[PDB]
A paper describes a structure:
Pyruvate dehydrogenase (PDH) is a multienzyme complex that catalyzes the oxidative transformation of pyruvate to acetyl coenzyme A (CoA), CO2, and reducing equivalents in the form of NADH. The first step involves decarboxylation of pyruvate, which proceeds through formation of a covalent intermediate with the thiamine diphosphate cofactor (ThDP) in the active site of the pyruvate decarboxylase subunit (E1p; EC 1.2.4.2). E1p also catalyzes the second reaction step in which the acetyl group is transferred regiospecifically onto one of the sulfur atoms of a lipoyl moiety. The E1p enzyme from pyruvate dehydrogenase is a prototypical thiamine-dependent decarboxylase subunit from the extensive family of 2-oxo acid dehydrogenases.
We have also solved the structure of the E1p/E2p-PSBD complex with bound 2-(1-hydroxyethyl)-3-deazaThDP at 2.5 Å resolution, representing an analog of the postdecarboxylation enamine-ThDP intermediate. We prepared cocrystals of G. stearothermophilus E1p/E2p-PSBD in complex with 2-(1-hydroxyethyl)-3-deazaThDP (he-3-deazaThDP), an analog of the enamine-ThDP intermediate. The ligand he-3-deazaThDP mimics the postdecarboxylation enamine-ThDP intermediate in both structure and charge state, but with a distorted geometry. The true enamine intermediate is sp2 hybridized at C2α, but the C2α atom of our analog is sp3 hybridized. Although a racemic mixture was used in the crystallizations, the electron density map suggests that the R enantiomer was preferred in the crystal. The H128β Nɛ atom contributes to a hydrogen-bonding network involving the OA atom of he-3-deazaThDP (distance of 3.4 Å) and the cofactor's N4′ (distance 2.5 Å). We observe that the inner and outer loops are also both ordered in the he-3-deazaThDP complex structure in all four subunits of the asymmetric unit. In the crystal structure of the he-3-deazaThDP, the pocket has few apparent fixed water molecules. Our docking model suggests that by simply flipping about the Cβ-Cγ bond, the H271α Nɛ is brought away from the thiazole and orientated toward the dithiolane ring of the oxidised lipoyl group. In one of the four asymmetric unit copies of the he-deazaThDP complex, the H271α appears to have made this flip, and this is correlated with the loss of the water molecule that links the side chain to the terminal phosphate of the ThDP.
Residue numbers in the entry:
A (entry chain I): 128 to 165
B (entry chain D), C (entry chain B): 1 to 324
D (entry chain C), E (entry chain A): 4 to 368
Amino acid sequence: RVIAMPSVRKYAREKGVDIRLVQGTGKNGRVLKEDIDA
Amino acid sequence: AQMTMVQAITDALRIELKNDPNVLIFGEDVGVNGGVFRATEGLQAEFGEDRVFDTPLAESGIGGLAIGLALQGFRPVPEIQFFGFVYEVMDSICGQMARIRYRTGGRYHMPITIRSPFGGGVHTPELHSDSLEGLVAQQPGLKVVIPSTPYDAKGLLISAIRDNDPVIFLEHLKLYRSFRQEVPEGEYTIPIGKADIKREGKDITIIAYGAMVHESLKAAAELEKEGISAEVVDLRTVQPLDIETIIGSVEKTGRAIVVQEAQRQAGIAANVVAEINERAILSLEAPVLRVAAPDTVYPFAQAESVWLPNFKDVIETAKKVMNF
Amino acid sequence: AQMTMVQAITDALRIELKNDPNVLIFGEDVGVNGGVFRATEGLQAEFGEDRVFDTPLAESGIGGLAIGLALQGFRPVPEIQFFGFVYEVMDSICGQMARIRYRTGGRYHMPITIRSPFGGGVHTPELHSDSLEGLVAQQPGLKVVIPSTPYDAKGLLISAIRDNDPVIFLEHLKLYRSFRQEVPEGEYTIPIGKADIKREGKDITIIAYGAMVHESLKAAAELEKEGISAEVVDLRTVQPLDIETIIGSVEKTGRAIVVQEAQRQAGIAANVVAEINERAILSLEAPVLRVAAPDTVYPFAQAESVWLPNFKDVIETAKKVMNF
Amino acid sequence: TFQFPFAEQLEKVAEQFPTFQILNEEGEVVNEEAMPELSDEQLKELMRRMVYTRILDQRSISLNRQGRLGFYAPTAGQEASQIASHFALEKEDFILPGYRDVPQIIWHGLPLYQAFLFSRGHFHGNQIPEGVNVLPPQIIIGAQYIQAAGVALGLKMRGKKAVAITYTGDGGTSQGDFYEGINFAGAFKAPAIFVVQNNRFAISTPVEKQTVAKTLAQKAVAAGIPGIQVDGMDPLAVYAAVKAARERAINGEGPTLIETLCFRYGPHTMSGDDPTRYRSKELENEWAKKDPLVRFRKFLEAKGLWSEEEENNVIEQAKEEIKEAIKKADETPKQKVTDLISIMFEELPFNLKEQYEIYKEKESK
Amino acid sequence: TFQFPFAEQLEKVAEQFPTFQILNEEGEVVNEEAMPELSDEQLKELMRRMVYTRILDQRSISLNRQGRLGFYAPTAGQEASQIASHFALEKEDFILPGYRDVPQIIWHGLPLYQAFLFSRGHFHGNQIPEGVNVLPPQIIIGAQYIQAAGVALGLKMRGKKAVAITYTGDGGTSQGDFYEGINFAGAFKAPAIFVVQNNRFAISTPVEKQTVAKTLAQKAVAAGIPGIQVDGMDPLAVYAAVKAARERAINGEGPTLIETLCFRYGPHTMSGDDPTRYRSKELENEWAKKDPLVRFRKFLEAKGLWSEEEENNVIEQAKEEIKEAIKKADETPKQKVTDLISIMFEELPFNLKEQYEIYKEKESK
Ligand SMILES: Cc1ncc(Cc2c([C@@H](C)O)sc(CCOP(=O)(O)OP(=O)(O)O)c2C)c(N)n1
Ligand SMILES: Cc1ncc(Cc2c([C@@H](C)O)sc(CCOP(=O)(O)OP(=O)(O)O)c2C)c(N)n1
Ligand SMILES: [K+]
Ligand SMILES: [K+]
Ligand SMILES: [Mg+2]
Ligand SMILES: [Mg+2]
Ligand SMILES: [Mg+2]
């Protein structure tokens, strides 16, 4: 149960982030950066 | 009883000749000779020259023959000595029999099954090992089947002969006598258009058909020694594709690769990658890669070893997907 | 310099007959008659019957005649009256001429070009309008070119005829004389295996070929009225594909759809989709969808309208990808 | 240097293929021995059908240039080769026609309104009524020949006393399929009758450039089966030839190839072919006089078996029926993409089930 | 009821195809009137080549069983129809061979070691030296026929006074391409020699099941070209038939079909169960006495042109040349994917350019 595709998936894994914790404003893409910041 | 693939094919033909007087087997040297690889051995002696017979040397004529016979109620099971000779009969198969039900608004149908060996790795002369199933896979009205095991071989042929629309049964040359397997005596069918899981896995899905299933299984056993759990799914029908099984498997693992013996610009791998991408792309952790042969003509016999995709190619690519 | 596509075709043939004495034009009814659609009209009367002639009715024969002539140094330009009839010449095209250079390790080669019209929309009889580009696209050693405008047609044919390897040149029936465009007189060439941007866009990339290009542009104008800026790419060579131009465009819009007139299980959309997913996977924002025809046999003339995809289906699929 | 008798070989061989004729140009019987056993009533029915087929040809052309019909291959001039050959058959016989042989399947049992649907391009035109042994017209030259040998072999295995008959043209004799068919039929000694209609042209190409064989009938020698060349403008000769062939076949003696020498007064097809670009106008007047309707009309009028009163009664009945077939084809419900999907397979595979749903919604708005 | 002369018809065509022979099974000349003009030194050269070719077959079989050669189709018993036919050609004539016609191309210029690489499956074996007019053996039965009509039409256009010759088997006459080929050559009046080697079997299928025609040579009639049936175990006869056919062609008179009646002493091929496939062996002994070498041997000895000392010489020479060719085939370097890709095109398309870098690296370490 995690919708994101597909570079969002590789971008979160490259920054050491688990995509499950973030709340996709739209399945993420630019909100992962917001996670890394806070 | 333990059987090889060629023995499973033989017994399935016998089961059908016996259950239906409309079934007929014919082609180049399929009679007294019993075929190039003994697939029809002993059938003519048991059922007579009326049911199992030979024909002049002309593929186009064998195909036309089958059409007429089916217009007269029979259930033809013709044979092309090697699938590299299908170019000779493309019009009958794709321009004729696959369109007859459609062309007659249901009035006539073509309950025909074409058998034909193909595949490399045995040193055959030119145009004997080519993989052209990609061609027949493109014609609406056909079903293309490619077994990889004796069990699957018997059940599918019976299912292919009973179907009332055209079916092409491709038998890989290398799989004819490479291994035995327990196969129930008597009739049983395997639905056409259903894939199956050969090896259960949780880390990566390997999609294959034909003799690449074996190679994939050998790579899977190697990947295991490093903690990589690969799930091997065998298509067993390349047209139509069993979407539900493929997609259901990839959504569980998130990673996947497709493997074919045919050149990159041929085969059905591209169709597989396309269906996957448009139905589960939101589950893919990495791109679905392809393992295929160079886009050149089928190699001269002595170079097969370095041209055909083997288990090592599957391993390298499988890693590439895990480390993407 | 306003010409229809059939005129650009004839002009390109006139030019090549003058510069290269080795060029020959032949097929069914291409001499005194000038062809079914007058593509070779006036040529025989100007260059002679020894260079422009009719042949007995037999595609298989025409293809075998072309191979032989090439071995004697000529540069053949045979014609298959309709591409639906390519099933008769399948062996000469794919089992022969495409493999001659490789087979002879470069000793002989086939500077051959096969002209042939296809496509629907003008109500033709059975097997005339079929789209079988996908069959020849799977045979390594061949190049398949499909133009969509008078300008692209003349320059591609000249490059085709000049190419020292086999090339299949498909001309769409509906584009023969449906519209006019500026075409410079004289020789000029356009590289084979090169696509061109027909319209610059910023929101989505629409890839097509043949008569679908027009529909795509048609669809792009309607979409502009809704704020969606579409980039239309015409492949113009369906084999090989211009990967750089395709990818370059997708890694700018991040979204895309592929449009073709052929059945979904046929055509070449599957390979373009597969290629995009393997190279621009990190730039995609939505799954790459295809716009194609239903998987049934090409429809009886009367049902072309409701069966053939048009600009309205491209409008719909484009919205799905944008609203993803 | 030693010489082989080549020129004598080509001559003697064609000597075995003289044109079989019964009725000449003026309608006189020049061959009493081969005269068929037909009653005065069968003779009048043969004429009624030929006059009727000529009217159908003229009406088709007219309705085609009006848009009412689509694809159409004229047959004017080939009435004997097509109708008199069919007259020699029985209901149980199987016909495998080519694109120009629509007249044969009409008389064999296909409702005329369905022929017009075949021209327009509608699947209901091809749904042959059960019990009527025919295939829709074949478009790919050669294919009906290799399919006829199968049908023929099929009839033989069931023990039926029927034949498979098939037609094609002069240009079709150059195809690879033409040769494999009569060769397979011969190797299996199957009840098939192969009819070749030499109308001297293949679209614009003259038969003289197709092959160098003196006759087309001699091509049967390659298969080892017997061949006969007959006057295609002679109805009584086509009927007798096909009659002898049918009998030989039902008696299990093998196939036969029949080459009729006929002609087509009309365009190759109604698409855009223009005859003035490839054949003489004075050459169209040489065959104008050899019209099968003219000679057969005189033959009958000489026996008091035909009057212009009976001919106009047939012309009327023809127009009236043509008019009804046309109204019936218009009343046929339009074709839907779901209708094209339903007739693809007996049981729809996965990819068509999806599409079926997809197009079932698009057809409900 | 009327009857067509179908029985008489088949008898008259048969009379037109008598078996042509110069030397009987004893070495005696039974046809002085047609004896070819050959000097003493040409007859000796014709024998040396036939003995040499018989030795090649024996070694090729041995080497294949040793796993030192790959695909191979035995030619023993067919030396007259193969070697004596090629002996009538000139250096500029183009040969389009079948999979069993390797001898012919060896004598026409293809180095022996390159014929072993062909067998093994090595591209260098197919790289024919420039100026030697031949194609590598054709596997697709029938394709070489439609291709010869092209090469031929070509020679005619350049004005060159050469001929295109091609070979196929009895089974091959059933293919549609066989028919299209000789018919196309006839329509264009092209300089082509079509040779059919009738050794009575297509794998396990006897020729009597291939067609109901009594001679394969009568198939020329469907094309309208001269046909000749010759004794395939008669060296001088096959030489004369091809020579006459060459003169006729180079004079712009057209193609000719030649059917030879020979036999094979060994298996169909050496591929699978073929070496153990059923063989009559009652039928072998019979054709064993008809051996081409046997009768030509006696023909020359009677003229004091062949001793048992020249035979041994040629046998030792062929054995030594065979040993160095097989050695040279071993020294040719292994093939790589890059070699096979560089020969797909003149200019590499993007997909292969990219694939070239991948295998380049996977090669070097
Ligand atoms: C294999 C093949 N090639 C080409 C065609 C196009 C074609 C026709 C369209 C219909 O497809 S009609 C025709 C000429 C046939 O000439 P014929 O055999 O003398 O018959 P007739 O004189 O009665 O027309 C051709 C070549 C075809 N149908 N099939
Ligand atoms: C189109 C086609 N069909 C089948 C084959 C398989 C095949 C052979 C493999 C080699 O492809 S050899 C052979 C029998 C040929 O018999 P023949 O014509 O009498 O010639 P011969 O007796 O010299 O073999 C066949 C059918 C083929 N090569 N090409
Ligand atoms: K079936
Ligand atoms: K070219
Ligand atoms: Mg063919
Ligand atoms: Mg005609
Ligand atoms: Mg043979």
